[PDB]
């Protein structure tokens, strides 16, 4: 199913699980990667991937971008590299699909997505001055798998 | 200051938690006054589905009736620190409960302008063990 079908916020917030059944499971494997036993404060560099347009990101897309991002951080810093990345959004919005013409059209439940306002941080990483470009590269790959354009903004980092 | 702070016995409640009574007779003798039936609440698997119905009996003693009972009741127990409340109450054993408190306890038992007894005026386990122990027996 094309994202063009769900990327816009053109429907009421649909999240009440007490009134919705049959909601598919999320495909997002982890929201906290790297060394999560360590605190983000222990790093000199903090880089975030910022969304430039308000949109909806289906859990399938989050998993893909997060995966292709962290996967790179693993390949370049190791299965235990000194870094930590976070996917701060969760897909609360339940999605439908009308899958019988336009009669009784209310769709059946088919998935979930996270609403992201433009300017917000979707992902945020924390690394050492060394692996600053490795995380910038992980993000370049991640924003290629989500609808909107993104800004790779560097927070704590005056080592230019 | 001490006269209106030195403990006393508000009530001694003797009771037999049976479960279906005929035992009223003995309590009426070991205490000196009429006993009261005990009803239960909530249905119970153990053939106890009848909500309201005799299951026990108790007798609340006050003043002399209470002391004249303890004089011959306390010697029948091996009181211990643990066997005491956080309010200064203790119950041993047929159950035998002793409610100890400071003078003006009425302030919380009257109808008009009643009030909760301040924690300072609330009896203490230590303060309780003392009073009692300070009268015909030992502690722990």
């Amino acid at each position: 199913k094309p994202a063009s079908m769900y990327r816009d916020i053109d429907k009421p917030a649909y999240t009440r699980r007490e009134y919705i059944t049959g909601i598919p499971g999320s495909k997002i494997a982890q929201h906290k990667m790297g060394r999560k036993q360590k605190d983000a404060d222990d790093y000199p560099v903090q880089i975030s991937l910022i969304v430039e347009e308000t949109v909806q990101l289906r859990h399938g897309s989050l998993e893909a971008s997060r995966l292709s991002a962290n996967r790179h951080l693993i390949k370049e810093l190791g299965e235990e590299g000194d870094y930590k990345m976070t996917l701060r959004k969760f897909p609360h919005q339940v999605l439908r699909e009308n899958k019988d013409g336009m009669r009784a059209a209310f769709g059946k439940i088919v998935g979930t997505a996270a609403r992201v306002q433009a300017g917000e941080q979707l992902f945020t990483a924390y690394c050492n001055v060394e692996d600053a470009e490795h995380v910038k590269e992980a993000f370049r790959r991640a924003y290629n798998k989500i609808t909107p354009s993104c800004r790779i903004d560097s927070s704590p980092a005056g080592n230019a | 200051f001490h006269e209106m702070r030195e403990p006393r016995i508000e009530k001694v409640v003797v009771h037999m938690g049976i479960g279906h009574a005929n035992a009223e007779d003995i309590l009426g003798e070991i205490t000196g006054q009429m006993p009261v039936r005990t009803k239960a609440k909530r249905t119970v698997g153990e053939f106890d589905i009848r909500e309201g119905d005799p299951i026990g009996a108790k007798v609340t003693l006050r003043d002399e009736m209470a002391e004249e009972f303890l004089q011959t009741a306390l010697p029948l127990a091996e009181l211990a620190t643990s066997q005491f409340d956080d309010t200064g109450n203790f119950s041993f054993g047929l159950d035998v409960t002793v409610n100890l408190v400071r003078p003006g306890y009425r302030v919380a038992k009257r109808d008009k302008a009643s009030r909760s007894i301040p924690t300072k005026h609330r009896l203490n386990p230590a303060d309780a063990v003392a009073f009692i122990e300070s009268t015909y027996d030992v502690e722990v």
Binding site: - | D111, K112, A113, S114, R115
Partner: protein, 186 residues
């Protein structure tokens, strides 16, 4: 107390001094209230009316100011209560008040009690108050007879401060006799 959503009772409720449900039913009469109260030593009768910023007491009597007319006896008994009601009642009539509803606050409707004696007193003073005779103590008890016979079981005077030995309900009579009399400085 616990949080923003916590519900604190109205002040007179926490203080456990006003039964609001009974109060409402009381006020529905549209008539003034004969507020009957009592302390360990005294008894107080007040004729209260409803007001914009709170109640308005129009007349009242305290068992203490009973002496002011010739009372040397204790002030926390039946004779005391009746006479106090009557005095308050008489003063009520003075201020133009003619009818009332008995408000016994948090006291119990026990037959023959003092709040009921206060009521009988206020009624005899000429005040129209809905009541029931068979809930009022018999005359003699109001006079204080029950106490005399209690002093009969003497061996040791009932009253410490000597007001008398065998006590006197006849004094009650002298006082009521004085109050029902016109003269009297209310």
């Amino acid at each position: 107390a616990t949080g923003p959503r916590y519900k604190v009772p109205m002040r007179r409720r926490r203080e456990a001094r006003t039964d609001y449900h009974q109060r409402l039913r009381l006020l529905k009469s549209g008539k003034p209230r004969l507020v009957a109260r009592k302390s360990n030593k005294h008894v107080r009768a007040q004729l209260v009316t409803l007001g914009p910023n709170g109640d308005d007491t129009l007349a009242s009597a305290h068992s203490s100011d009973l002496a002011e007319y010739g009372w040397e006896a204790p002030t926390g008994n039946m004779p005391s209560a009746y006479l106090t009601g009557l005095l308050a009642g008489l003063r009520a009539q003075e201020a133009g008040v003619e009818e009332a509803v008995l408000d016994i606050g948090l006291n119990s409707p026990t037959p023959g009690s003092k709040v009921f004696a206060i009521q009988e007193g206020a009624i005899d003073a000429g005040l129209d108050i809905p009541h029931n005779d068979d809930v009022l103590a018999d005359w003699q008890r109001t006079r204080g007879a029950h106490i005399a016979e209690y002093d009969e079981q003497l061996e040791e005077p009932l009253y410490s401060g000597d007001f008398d030995a065998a006590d006197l309900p006849e004094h009650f009579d002298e006082l009521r006799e004085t109050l029902l009399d016109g003269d009297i400085e209310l």
